[PDB]
């Protein structure tokens, strides 16, 4: 019941899952979505056409205000960097600026050895 | 390395003539300086090895020259080792 | 080129990410490539040029 009018939307695009939260201008949570919470779980998610149905779920929780326009914050790789923005363009929302906020360091921390099969 | 006002300076102190930057008496003496001067440098840092390699170079290189003098004019040897306070 | 104040002749050797453009798509005699990059680095401290772009 605040009517933020316009607020950026963060798209935490990951591999094992993807989640988009339609925060406000300053950066306050107004409504978040989630593939894991979008019916199918396990790992069936991930896929782009699976995240789209997730972020689209926001237009059902963050619609209580009246977002007439909004930007997009895509972070991290994975099947949900495009899908999300698309579903949002159809949901009825607008757009003000697309950008990738993926954490790209300068050889700072030393990543995990991991995987070796 | 070394400053011109010094290198071109000393040369005119050991040279048996003028601008004889070749003369052992000269070159040799010219080596002691850059050596003694660096000793104060190596006193600090220490771990700086790659610089000492060059230091040792000019040292042995200097000796290679001293042996020569002894084998070309006994006098000049003992006549120069003093002006440089060498031998220690 | 050897400087940083000549910010005018630098915005060309970058992009929307302020990243130093490769020498592949420049063939800047190499020797110059070296100097060209050195400027963009030190020049970024004087805030003359940007490091990243997101901030």
């Amino acid at each position: 019941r605040k009517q933020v009018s316009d607020g950026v939307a963060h798209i935490h695009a990951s591999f094992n899952n993807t989640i988009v939260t339609i925060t406000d201008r300053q950066g306050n949570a107004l409504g978040w979505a989630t593939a894991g919470g979008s019916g199918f779980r396990g790992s069936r998610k991930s896929t782009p056409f699976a995240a789209q149905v997730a972020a689209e779920r926001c237009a059902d929780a963050v619609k209580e205000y009246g977002i007439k326009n909004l930007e997009v914050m895509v972070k991290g790789p994975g099947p949900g960097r495009e899908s999300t923005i698309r579903a949002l363009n159809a949901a009825g929302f607008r757009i003000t600026n697309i950008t990738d906020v993926t954490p790209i360091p300068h050889n700072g921390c030393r990543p995990p050895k991991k995987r070796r099969v | 390395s070394l400053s011109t006002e010094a290198t071109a300076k000393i040369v005119s102190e050991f040279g048996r003539d003028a601008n004889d930057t070749g003369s052992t008496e000269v070159q040799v003496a010219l080596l002691t300086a850059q050596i003694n001067h660096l000793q104060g440098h190596f006193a600090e840092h220490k771990k700086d090895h790659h610089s000492r390699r060059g230091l040792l170079r000019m040292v042995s290189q200097r000796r290679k020259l001293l042996d020569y003098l002894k084998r070309k004019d006994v006098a000049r040897y003992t006549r120069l080792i003093e002006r440089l306070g060498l031998r220690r | 080129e050897i400087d940083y104040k000549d910010i005018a002749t630098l915005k060309n050797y970058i992009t929307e990410s302020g990243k130093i453009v490769p020498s592949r798509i420049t063939g800047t005699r190499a020797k110059y490539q070296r100097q060209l990059a050195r400027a963009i680095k030190r020049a970024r401290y004087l805030s003359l040029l940007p490091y990243t772009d997101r901030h």
């Binding site: 991290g76 790789p77 960097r81 495009e82 923005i85 698309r86 363009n89 607008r94 757009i95 003000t96 600026n97 697309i98 950008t99 990738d100 993926t102 790209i104 360091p105 030393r110 990543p111 995990p112 050895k113 991991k114 995987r115 | - | 992009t15 929307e16 990410s17 990243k19 772009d53 997101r54």
Partner: protein, 51 residues
């Protein structure tokens, strides 16, 4: 990476910044590092680029 356009449309322009960073220098990190594995495979893949 910074998009912005007048006349609402979901054209793209987005894959334009997708040529300098993006999912590349990302997966580059992802798993472990490299050390000797790169200086080598980086100097062998170079051989490939010849013909």
């Amino acid at each position: 990476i910074k998009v912005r356009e007048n006349e609402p449309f979901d054209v793209a322009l987005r894959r334009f910044k997708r040529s300098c960073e993006k999912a590349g220098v990302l997966a580059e990190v992802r798993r472990r590092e490299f050390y000797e594995k790169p200086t080598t495979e980086r100097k062998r893949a170079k051989a490939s680029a010849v013909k």
